[PDB]
DNA sequence: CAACGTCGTGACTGGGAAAACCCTGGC
DNA sequence: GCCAGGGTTTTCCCAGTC
DNA sequence: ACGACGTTG
């Protein structure tokens, strides 16, 4: 770490000299810093650059600390750097460049030449290799501990903002960060040049997805606090009466959200044997035992409704309206990308993905999500997309014929297992079939099937054998992928994304079974996520090309929620059909079920 | 070396509450 | 030196996608 | 209900 070899820039002439160094550099680190972690407001503080290793410069344009001399106006710096920033040819590297692009766009400047981002480099090298933030990269490829903001800030309360810190140590911090990013890129990129499939995935899918994520985050989502506030009162009422009834049944007052007290009082009153134990080892009060014991006593069922209602109230109606952005009135998520081993995206801050559906109050909270005036919600969805993936990859003639006809075998198997007629199967039974069938594809044991559907374990075994008799090509494909994981030491997706499994070697056996099932799991879900990502890329490309009133707000796993004006509905629906159907070259069509409604629940 | 008792027995996520424990500050 | 409180960690348990 | 692994005879 060639520290203290950098420079802090306080004059515009040295800024001209620095950019005259920059424009001819092939790649150069670039990062910006701000006081707050919320990108939406995020008033800017400063920026840094670095051309060659050991050399970096910081320009403080906004600080408030006592006696700040000759800090360059942010306007002049932005005007001078705009030709470099808006240039497409210029190639840049950095950390969390989505944040940087968002901050720049807050001032009306769109960064174009996003060449490489270190976190994506590390993620595409090896998904399961620890954390992918800056500290882990520094530790595992530079072996040099770096100065963190905690060192110059407070412990847990008095974390003074980056604007009110002195220029010297702040500039050294920023220059060191930019430099470490630079050597990380220079070390990591040639190593990625070695492999082919990961290189193609990195060049095609991952990187161009930063601007679309930034724009989607900047769009925001609209919600009404009023409906949530109203629903909260009925939640509180219902929980009050159910709690009163439960405590009159027990004759004692205890917290029904406290698992310890619940299990103690239950197992000391009923005196019945505990059927299942916690993974750490203890009496447990999970769902399935509760539905099992509800037939005998009213306390199990009433605490079941209590658990559901309390979870709903304490999570959704108490987090969603509180986190609304003040100046815009629209909720903003995070959408971190390099977090999952498989490759799918994951919402972080408010987690607008696990919105309850099955419960009537769940579809009510779904109804709560509404659109602004003259705008209608449009949903574009794949159906059984990974089933089409699996049929394409295994070339099983049964699945090929079923998808050629378009049969809802996903629902037909539910009708068979539950005994329901094909026409009377409901949504929850469809979800249960989803779980059962797809676990059966993923090696889900017959004991798990007996637990899920309450059917005898013998029936679970026999019907698993039957299901694999229908599709023997599927079984031999899992066997082939197991052999591939054993030999290669990893599993690769169709487009080239990889998952390294260090547990494929013999280790107590049981651990390998999880590693084995993950080896089967990785390709299918990875390809589904990659198809979703490329569909988003093409859709947003058309968005930027045409610039109509359509906006994109939300991404749910196998779902793309839109925002269109009420006047134009069918045209954008056909456009989405054309782009989303033709995004991926696959044997069977990627059938899409478009939907339009007033609010989110109306769409689906 | 064999038999029996115990430990699992789809994947991928975030997060809430409760509780426990440990570290540090104050008297 | 000791106790209490707060912060951090650990356990159950539950809400989604397939 | 059944297989895997550790412990004990
Ligand atoms: Mg971010």
Please report the DSSP string for A357-416 in residue order.
-SSHHHHHHHHHB---TTEEEEEE-BSSHHHHHHHHHH--HHHHHHHHHT--HHHHHHHH
CATH no. for A386-528: 1.10.150.20
**Closest Cα to residue A143, out of A135, A151, A131?**
A135
Fold classified for A225-348: Taq DNA Polymerase; Chain T, domain 4 (1.20.1060)
Q: How far is CA A99 from CA A164, A176, A334, A335, in A?
A: 21, 19, 10, 11
The span from the CA of A364 to the CA of A197, in Å, is 44
Distance A332 CA to B17 C1' (A): 25
Q: Which of residues 334-353 of A touch strand B (CB under 7 A)?
A: 339-342, 346-351
Distance A353 CA to B11 C1' (A): 17
Q: Which of residues 452-481 of A touch strand D (CB under 7 A)?
A: 456-458
List all residues 6 or more positions away from A208 whose beta carbon is below 8 Å from its beta carbon. Answer: A537
SS3 content of chain A, % helix, strand, coil (to 5): 50, 10, 35
Structure tokens at A577: 């059909």
DSSP result, A499-511: EE-TTSS-STTHH
Resolution stated for this PDB structure, in Å = 4.3
Strand D contact with A511 (CB < 7 A): no
Structure tokens at A483: 């052999």
Strand B contact with A438 (CB < 7 A): yes
Strand B contact with A517 (CB < 7 A): yes
Strand B contact with A278 (CB < 7 A): no
CA A51 to centroid of ligand 1, rounded, Å:
25
The span from the CA of A203 to the CA of A339, in Å, is 19
- Helix extents (H) in A70-159: 74-85, 97-106, 118-125, 134-137, 149-152
CB atoms within 10 A of CB A333: 20
Name the experimental technique: cryo-EM
Strand C contact with A287 (CB < 7 A): yes
Buried-state track A497-512, b at ≥16 Cβ within 10 A, e below 16: bbbebebbeeeeeeeb
CA A103 to centroid of ligand 1, rounded, Å:
11
Q: Where are the domains of chain A?
A: 6-221, 225-348, 386-528
Contact A53, A71 (CB under 8 A): no
Four-way CATH pick for A6-221: 3.20.20.70, 3.40.630.150, 3.40.50.300, 3.30.420.10? 3.30.420.10
The span from the CA of A165 to the CA of A394, in Å, is 60
For residue A78, the Cα-to-chain-centroid distance in whole angstroms is 33
Distance A257 CA to B16 C1' (A): 10
CA A99 to centroid of ligand 1, rounded, Å:
5
- The pocket of ion ligand 1, defined by CB under 5 A, consists of A 99
CA A42 to centroid of ligand 1, rounded, Å:
12
Strand B contact with A315 (CB < 7 A): yes
Output DSSP code: residue A164: G
């Amino acid at each position: 770490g060639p520290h203290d070899n950098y420079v802090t820039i306080l004059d515009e002439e040295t800024l001209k000299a620095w950019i005259a160094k920059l424009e001819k550099a092939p790649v150069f680190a670039f990062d910006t810093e701000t006081d707050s972690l919320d990108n939406i407001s995020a008033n800017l503080v400063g920026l840094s650059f670095a051309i060659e290793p050991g050399v970096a410069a910081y320009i403080p344009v906004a600080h408030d600390y006592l006696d700040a001399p000759d800090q360059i106006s942010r306007e002049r710096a932005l005007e001078l750097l705009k030709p470099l920033l808006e240039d497409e040819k210029a190639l840049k590297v950095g950390q969390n460049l989505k944040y940087d692009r968002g901050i720049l766009a807050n001032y009306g400047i769109e960064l174009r030449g996003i060449a490489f981002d270190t976190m994506l480099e590390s993620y595409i090298l090896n998904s399961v290799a620890g954390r992918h933030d800056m500290d882990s990269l520094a530790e595992r490829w530079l072996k040099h501990k770096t100065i963190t903001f905690e060192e110059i800030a407070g412990k847990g309360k008095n974390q003074l903002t980056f604007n009110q810190i002195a220029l010297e140590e702040a500039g050294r911090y920023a220059a060191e960060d930019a430099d470490v990013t630079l050597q990380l890129h220079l070390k990591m990129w040639p190593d990625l040049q070695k492999h082919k499939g990961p290189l193609n995935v990195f060049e095609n899918i991952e990187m161009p997805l930063v601007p679309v994520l930034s724009r989607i985050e900047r769009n925001g989502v609209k919600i009404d606090p009023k409906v949530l506030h109203n629903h909260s009162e009925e939640l509180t009422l219902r929980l009050a009466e159910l709690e009163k009834k439960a405590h009159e049944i027990a004759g004692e007052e205890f917290n029904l959200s406290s698992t310890k007290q619940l299990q103690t009082i239950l197992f000391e009153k009923q005196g019945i044997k505990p059927l299942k134990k916690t993974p750490g080892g203890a009496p447990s009060t999970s769902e399935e035992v509760l539905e099992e014991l509800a037939l005998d006593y009213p306390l199990p069922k009433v605490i079941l409704e209590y658990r559901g209602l309390a979870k709903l109230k304490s999570t959704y109606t108490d987090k969603l309206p509180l986190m609304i952005n003040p100046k815009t009135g629209r909720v903003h998520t995070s959408y971190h990308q390099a977090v999952t081993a498989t490759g799918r995206l994951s919402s972080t801050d408010p987690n607008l993905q696990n919105i309850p559906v099955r419960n009537e109050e769940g579809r009510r909270i779904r109804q709560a999500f509404i659109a602004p005036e003259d705008y209608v919600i449009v949903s574009a969805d794949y159906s059984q997309i990974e089933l089409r993936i699996m049929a394409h990859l295994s070339r099983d003639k049964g699945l090929l014929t079923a998808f050629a006809e378009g049969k809802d075998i996903h629902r037909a198997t539910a009708a068979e297992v539950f005994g329901l007629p094909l026409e009377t199967v409901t949504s929850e039974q469809r979800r249960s079939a989803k779980a059962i069938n797809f676990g059966l594809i993923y090696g889900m044991s017959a004991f798990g099937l007996a637990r899920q559907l309450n059917i005898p374990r013998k029936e679970a075994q026999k019907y698993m054998d039957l299901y694999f008799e229908r599709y023997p090509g599927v079984l031999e494909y899992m066997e082939r992928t197991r052999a591939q994981a054993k030999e290669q030491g990893y599993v690769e997706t169709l487009d080239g994304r990889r998952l390294y499994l260090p547990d494929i070697k013999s280790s107590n056996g049981a651990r390998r079974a999880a590693a084995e099932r993950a080896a089967i799991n990785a390709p299918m879900q990875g390809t589904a996520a990659d198809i979703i990502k490329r569909a988003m890329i093409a859709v947003d490309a058309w968005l930027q090309a045409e610039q109509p009133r359509v906006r994109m707000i939300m991404q749910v796993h196998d779902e793309l929620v839109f925002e269109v004006h009420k006047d134009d509905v069918d045209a954008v629906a056909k456009q989405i059909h054309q782009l989303m159907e033709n995004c991926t070259r696959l044997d069977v069509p990627l059938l899409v079920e478009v939907g339009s409604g007033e609010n989110w629940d109306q769409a689906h």
